[PDB]
Amino acid sequence: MQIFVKTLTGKTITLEVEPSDTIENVKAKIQDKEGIPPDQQRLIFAGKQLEDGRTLSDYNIQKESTLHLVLRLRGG
Protein backbone atom coordinates (compact mmCIF):
# COMPACT_ATOMS: atom_id res chain seq x y z
CA MET A 1 0.00 0.00 0.00
CA GLN A 2 0.91 3.69 -0.22
CA ILE A 3 0.34 6.87 1.78
CA PHE A 4 0.08 10.58 1.02
CA VAL A 5 2.34 13.14 2.66
CA LYS A 6 2.09 16.90 2.19
CA THR A 7 5.61 18.30 1.96
CA LEU A 8 6.49 21.81 3.07
CA THR A 9 6.79 23.31 -0.42
CA GLY A 10 3.06 23.02 -1.14
CA LYS A 11 3.56 19.92 -3.27
CA THR A 12 2.22 16.54 -2.25
CA ILE A 13 4.06 13.25 -2.66
CA THR A 14 2.92 9.65 -2.21
CA LEU A 15 5.00 7.23 -0.13
CA GLU A 16 4.97 3.47 -0.68
CA VAL A 17 4.98 2.10 2.87
CA GLU A 18 3.87 -0.91 4.89
CA PRO A 19 2.26 -0.82 8.36
CA SER A 20 5.19 -2.76 9.83
CA ASP A 21 7.57 -0.05 8.63
CA THR A 22 9.11 2.18 11.28
CA ILE A 23 8.93 5.97 11.25
CA GLU A 24 12.70 6.30 10.87
CA ASN A 25 12.52 4.69 7.44
CA VAL A 26 9.53 6.93 6.69
CA LYS A 27 11.67 9.99 7.35
CA ALA A 28 14.47 8.47 5.26
CA LYS A 29 11.97 8.05 2.42
CA ILE A 30 11.03 11.71 2.84
CA GLN A 31 14.75 12.50 2.68
CA ASP A 32 15.59 10.66 -0.52
CA LYS A 33 12.32 11.97 -1.97
CA GLU A 34 13.19 15.65 -1.44
CA GLY A 35 16.03 15.80 1.08
CA ILE A 36 15.42 17.43 4.46
CA PRO A 37 17.43 15.60 7.09
CA PRO A 38 15.90 12.84 9.27
CA ASP A 39 16.21 15.13 12.29
CA GLN A 40 14.36 18.14 10.88
CA GLN A 41 11.12 16.45 9.87
CA ARG A 42 8.25 16.37 12.33
CA LEU A 43 5.46 14.31 10.81
CA ILE A 44 1.98 15.23 12.02
CA PHE A 45 -1.11 13.02 11.88
CA ALA A 46 -4.24 14.26 13.65
CA GLY A 47 -2.04 16.75 15.47
CA LYS A 48 0.37 14.16 16.84
CA GLN A 49 4.11 13.86 16.52
CA LEU A 50 4.99 10.69 14.64
CA GLU A 51 7.60 9.28 17.01
CA ASP A 52 10.77 8.06 15.33
CA GLY A 53 10.89 4.74 17.18
CA ARG A 54 7.47 3.50 16.10
CA THR A 55 5.56 2.21 13.07
CA LEU A 56 2.51 3.40 11.15
CA SER A 57 0.35 0.59 12.52
CA ASP A 58 0.91 2.06 15.99
CA TYR A 59 -0.80 5.32 15.00
CA ASN A 60 -3.84 3.73 13.29
CA ILE A 61 -2.83 4.73 9.75
CA GLN A 62 -4.52 3.14 6.73
CA LYS A 63 -4.58 3.54 2.95
CA GLU A 64 -5.25 6.91 1.28
CA SER A 65 -4.47 8.68 4.56
CA THR A 66 -2.40 11.86 4.81
CA LEU A 67 0.65 12.83 6.84
CA HIS A 68 1.66 16.45 7.36
CA LEU A 69 5.29 17.57 7.23
CA VAL A 70 6.57 20.62 9.11
CA LEU A 71 9.85 22.01 10.42
CA ARG A 72 11.26 20.87 13.75
CA LEU A 73 10.14 23.00 16.70
CA ARG A 74 10.37 22.95 20.50
CA GLY A 75 8.60 24.22 23.60
CA GLY A 76 9.00 27.52 25.39
Partner: protein
Protein backbone atom coordinates in the same frame (compact mmCIF):
# COMPACT_ATOMS: atom_id res chain seq x y z
CA UNK B 1 1.01 4.63 -60.59
CA UNK B 2 2.96 5.03 -57.34
CA UNK B 3 2.34 8.09 -55.16
CA UNK B 4 3.16 8.24 -51.43
CA UNK B 5 2.70 11.96 -50.70
CA UNK B 6 1.14 13.94 -47.85
CA UNK B 7 -0.20 17.47 -48.25
CA UNK B 8 -1.22 18.75 -44.80
CA UNK B 9 -0.94 17.82 -41.14
CA UNK B 10 -2.28 18.68 -37.68
CA UNK B 11 -1.23 17.00 -34.43
CA UNK B 12 -0.96 17.61 -30.69
CA UNK B 13 1.69 17.13 -28.03
CA UNK B 14 1.59 17.05 -24.24
CA UNK B 15 4.34 18.97 -22.46
CA UNK B 16 5.77 17.81 -19.14
CA UNK B 17 8.52 19.14 -16.91
CA UNK B 18 12.02 17.69 -16.94
CA UNK B 19 12.01 16.75 -13.24
CA UNK B 20 9.29 18.59 -11.30
CA UNK B 21 7.74 22.05 -10.93
CA UNK B 22 10.24 22.60 -8.09
CA UNK B 23 7.82 24.76 -6.14
CA UNK B 24 9.52 27.81 -4.67
CA UNK B 25 8.80 27.87 -0.95
CA UNK B 26 9.27 31.57 -0.20
CA UNK B 27 6.83 32.85 -2.81
CA UNK B 28 4.86 29.72 -3.84
CA UNK B 29 5.17 30.53 -7.55
CA UNK B 30 5.98 28.25 -10.47
CA UNK B 31 9.62 28.16 -11.50
CA UNK B 32 9.11 29.33 -15.08
CA UNK B 33 6.70 31.92 -13.69
CA UNK B 34 8.44 34.97 -12.33
CA UNK B 35 9.05 35.80 -8.68
CA UNK B 36 5.97 37.07 -6.87
CA UNK B 37 7.58 40.50 -6.53
CA UNK B 38 8.96 40.27 -10.08
CA UNK B 39 5.45 39.76 -11.47
CA UNK B 40 4.57 43.36 -10.60
CA UNK B 41 5.88 45.39 -13.55
CA UNK B 42 14.73 38.57 -15.50
CA UNK B 43 13.89 36.64 -12.32
CA UNK B 44 16.38 33.78 -12.21
CA UNK B 45 16.28 30.62 -10.10
CA UNK B 46 19.19 30.05 -7.72
CA UNK B 47 20.01 26.64 -6.30
CA UNK B 48 21.27 25.70 -2.88
CA UNK B 49 23.76 22.89 -2.29
CA UNK B 50 20.69 21.08 -0.95
CA UNK B 51 19.51 21.19 -4.63
CA UNK B 52 16.63 23.30 -3.27
CA UNK B 53 15.23 25.75 -5.79
CA UNK B 54 14.42 29.33 -4.90
CA UNK B 55 13.96 32.44 -6.97
CA UNK B 56 17.00 34.65 -6.60
CA UNK B 57 14.80 37.60 -5.66
CA UNK B 58 13.32 35.61 -2.76
CA UNK B 59 16.33 33.74 -1.45
CA UNK B 60 18.53 36.83 -1.61
CA UNK B 61 16.15 38.68 0.71
CA UNK B 62 15.82 35.69 3.02
CA UNK B 63 19.61 35.41 3.18
CA UNK B 64 19.76 39.12 3.96
CA UNK B 65 17.57 38.10 6.92
CA UNK B 66 19.18 34.69 7.58
CA UNK B 67 22.14 32.72 6.20
CA UNK B 68 20.11 29.50 6.37
CA UNK B 69 18.13 27.54 3.81
CA UNK B 70 14.43 27.62 4.80
CA UNK B 71 13.64 23.98 4.06
CA UNK B 72 16.93 22.39 5.06
CA UNK B 73 19.11 23.96 7.75
CA UNK B 74 22.30 23.78 5.69
CA UNK B 75 24.00 26.88 4.30
CA UNK B 76 23.19 28.47 0.94
CA UNK B 77 25.55 28.18 -2.03
CA UNK B 78 24.90 27.60 -5.73
CA UNK B 79 26.82 25.24 -8.04
Amino acid sequence: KKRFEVKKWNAVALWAWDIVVDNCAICRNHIMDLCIECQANECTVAWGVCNHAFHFHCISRWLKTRQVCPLDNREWEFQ
